Amino acid sequence: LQFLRDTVFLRYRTRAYRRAAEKWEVAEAVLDVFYKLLKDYEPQPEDFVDQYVELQGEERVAFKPPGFSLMHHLLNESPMLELCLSLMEEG
Amino acid sequence: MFVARSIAADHKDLIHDVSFDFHGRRMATCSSDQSVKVWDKSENGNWHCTASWKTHSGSVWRVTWAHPEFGQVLASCSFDRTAAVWEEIVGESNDKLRGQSHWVKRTTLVDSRTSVTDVKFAPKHMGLMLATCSADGVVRIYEAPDVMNLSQWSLQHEISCKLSCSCISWNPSSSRAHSPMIAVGSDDSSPNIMGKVQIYEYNENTRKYAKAETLMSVSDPVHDIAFAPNLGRSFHILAVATKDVRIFTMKPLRKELSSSGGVTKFEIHTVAQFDNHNSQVWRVSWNITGTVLASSGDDGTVRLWKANYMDNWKCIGVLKGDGNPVGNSYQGF
Amino acid sequence: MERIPLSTEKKALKALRICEQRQMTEQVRSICKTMAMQSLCNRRLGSALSWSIRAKDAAFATLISDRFLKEYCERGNFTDLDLIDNLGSAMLLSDRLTFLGKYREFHRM
Amino acid sequence: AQTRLTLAKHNPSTAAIAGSSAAEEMVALLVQAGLFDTAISLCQTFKLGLTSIFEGLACKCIRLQQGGEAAQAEAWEWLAANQLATVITTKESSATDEAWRLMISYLDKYESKNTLYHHCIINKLLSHGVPLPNWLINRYKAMDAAELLRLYLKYDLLEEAAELVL
Amino acid sequence: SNEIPEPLQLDFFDRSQIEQVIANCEHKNRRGQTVCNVKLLHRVLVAEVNALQGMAAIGQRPLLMEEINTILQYVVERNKLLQCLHAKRHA
């Protein structure tokens, strides 16, 4: 998620292309995969707690789901939403 | 107040073992006379000789019984490198109680070449299975799919626990998501061999019986093992009669997925380590409810313990075989 | 109570009542199948059907159906078509039981 | 004609395809749909081999062994249509045991030509990487011994072949 | 638009038990009948009646399907009569 948000979404706007349709195609792909991920993932209270599991003799905690942090950053302040509003103004 | 005598039974040679039906009334014996005798204790207070017939020609040893709900069969152990199962077949219908009844040999337990250890039954749950074991470390599981043919023994499981298995105990499931447990105590005739207790589980991911956990503490030749009756709990209690009084408790820790794949994290704690017998123990038996423990020894001493309140066992009954039972203590109800 | 027999009446009735009140039918079916096999040992009909209805079994139902079919084949025809028609003709227990009932009624049909 | 009728009843849109297809294609379609008995009947009528039907049955068995209760509930509808009227014990509502009894009945009612179907099933199971069942292992140990060691070289099983030759 | 419903059916299970399960699953939003998503309730009921297993009960699948369809039609008639009764009472 961080790779697609920073190294892709925050780099394709700075890099150049051969035609103007490449940025539109990559934005379509990003928006489609994000919509599909949001439709597949649902918020649940069992994923917000730190569950203890024995992994190779080590009791590791359960990490936070990516969609939780994504929607938290979206509700707070997200450069992804900033670029979304920018492309909306452009359209 | 008990009518105790100095002589019993009718076996002239060395009487080995006896057994009784779960419904009572019916009993059976196995001695060195190569002839087993079945008795029927009536309600009048007398137990006459109901039947007596030959079975084995190599000193019959153990004897097991089953519930009449699944078939009245008798599986006995002997030292003739073979074993068979006897059945009781009655005729007529049901006009004057039961008609003429007779003992027959419907089938003979095959795959027996060495000394047979134990061939008792198994809990139902997923079907009434028969566990065949010997003195080599191979345990076979047979099933009876045909209810009208008692001679069919389909082999669907053959586990190799290695070493030389001696005693085998079972632990049924407590719900619909629990798997049966099997404890195996070996007897390699060598106390210098580390590791004699093996635990096997019914893994749902492999549909077999893999080694769940092992125990390297008990290294002496195990003589008998007995699990506690399931009372709807997660932990379990085990009594290991080898050379002293050993009672352990197995507590679960991780019995879910991910953290417990093919093995289960179970902690074994020695909750009773006594040795007031000053000798060795032979067999150990639990009560039908899970409160009385019975055992004997080679020196002619029988020790019976009862439960208290702290999961401890103290000697309540002490009987001398060669001598006379001393002491008197009856609490009552 | 799973080791001692039950040959009484009111005792077993109260036991079954408290069992159906506590909602637990494992030992209930375990005793019902024993009663069904004891009735089949004497070749019963109505009692066996009642026990099968109370137990909702399958293997014992197939066994008694095969026994009835063998008896019909040995006797040539069937005359006890009304002894097992008191608990059925609506509650579809199983396919083979429904077929046996429909044949028993096709007799009169 | 009856196979084309069954295919049209399953899906009425491939009538010309079912009419122009061959016996092998019809058997493959029946196996993919879930009619192992009809596929075996088709193969025995056309005088061919049940290798495709046996591979499909092995794949279904592997799916049943690897899946949870959802897989059992989804495959029960296709497994009950294969005549599951065996003489077994009560409360046997397990798709794994049902498939095992179906395979046992198939092997008892139609023996293999030269145990080639056994090697086919062994290769199909080794392609997935699931150990052989204990009953089949015992049956194969009782019926043969050498071909198992010869086929173990495909999956590179060292300790198994070691204890076997021992 | 008052459609007379049908009495309790299905001699296998208990119509009172089905009604209690429906009331425990779906709550009350804007109608008197405890229902929210008809498709979700139908899928839940199908899963519940399918998870009962059954060895010799293979022939009962069309009967179970027709019973589910009958319960669905009963719920539809209940909703159709309630949406008319509420409007009539409001007017």
Features:
part of a larger assembly, 5 chains, C: 109 residues, mainly alpha, 5 helices, D: 166 residues, 11 helices, globular, MGC83295 protein (chain A), Nuclear pore complex protein Nup85 (chain C), transport (chain B), cell division (chain B), structural molecule activity (chain B)
Q: How is the topology of this model organized?
A:
This is part of a larger assembly, with two copies of chain A (about 90 residues), one copy of chain B (about 325 residues), one copy of chain C (about 110 residues) and one copy of chain D (about 170 residues).
Chain B: E1 17-20, E2 26-30, E3 35-41, E4 47-54, E5 60-65, E6 73-78, E7 85-90, E8 101-107, E9 129-132, E10 138-143, E11 154-160, E12 165-171, E13 181-186, E14 197-201, E15 210-215, E16 224-227, E17 236-241, E18 245-254, E19 265-274, E20 281-286, E21 292-297, E22 301-306, E23 314-320
Antiparallel strand pairs in B: 1-2, 2-3, 3-4, 5-6, 6-7, 7-8, 9-10, 10-11, 12-13, 13-14, 14-15, 16-17, 17-18, 18-19, 20-21, 21-22, 22-23
Chain C: H1 10-22, H2 26-41, H3 46-55, H4 59-75, H5 95-108
Helix pairs in contact in C: 2-3
Chain D: H1 2-10, H2 15-20, H3 23-33, H4 36-46, H5 51-66, H6 69-79, H7 95-109, H8 116-128, H9 134-143, H10 146-155, H11 158-165
Write a brief caption for the model:
This is part of a larger assembly, with 2 copies of chain A (91 residues), 1 copy of chain B (333 residues), 1 copy of chain C (109 residues) and 1 copy of chain D (166 residues). Chain A has 91 residues and is mainly alpha-helical.
Describe, in plain words, how this protein is organized in 3D.
- It is classed as nuclear protein.
- The structure is cut from a larger assembly and holds two copies of chain A (91 residues), one copy of chain B (333 residues), one copy of chain C (109 residues) and one copy of chain D (166 residues).
- Chain A is mostly helical and 91 residues long.
- Helix content of chain A is 55%, strand content 7%.
- Chain A has helices at 2-8, 21-40, 66-76, 79-90, and strands spanning 53-55, 58-60.
- In chain A, strands 1-2 form a two-stranded antiparallel ribbon.
- The radius of gyration of chain A is 17 Å and the shape is elongated.
- The relative contact order of chain A is 0.11.
- Helices cover 0% and strands 44% of the residues of chain B.
- Chain B is built from no helices and 23 strands.
- Chain B has strands at residues 17-20, 26-30, 35-41, 47-54, 60-65, 73-78, 85-90, 101-107, 129-132, 138-143, 154-160, 165-171, 181-186, 197-201, 210-215, 224-227, 236-241, 245-254, 265-274, 281-286, 292-297, 301-306, 314-320.
- Chain B has a four-stranded antiparallel sheet with strand order 1-2-3-4, with no helix packed on it.
- Chain B is globular and about 60 Å long.
- Chain C is mainly α and 109 residues long.
- Chain C has five helices and no strands.
- In chain C, helix 2 (26-41) packs antiparallel against helix 3 (46-55).
- Chain D has eleven helices and no strands.
- Chain D is globular.
- The relative contact order of chain D is 0.08.
- Chains in contact: A-B, B-C, B-D, C-D, C-E, D-E.
- The A-B interface holds A 53-55 and B 254, 258-260, 265.
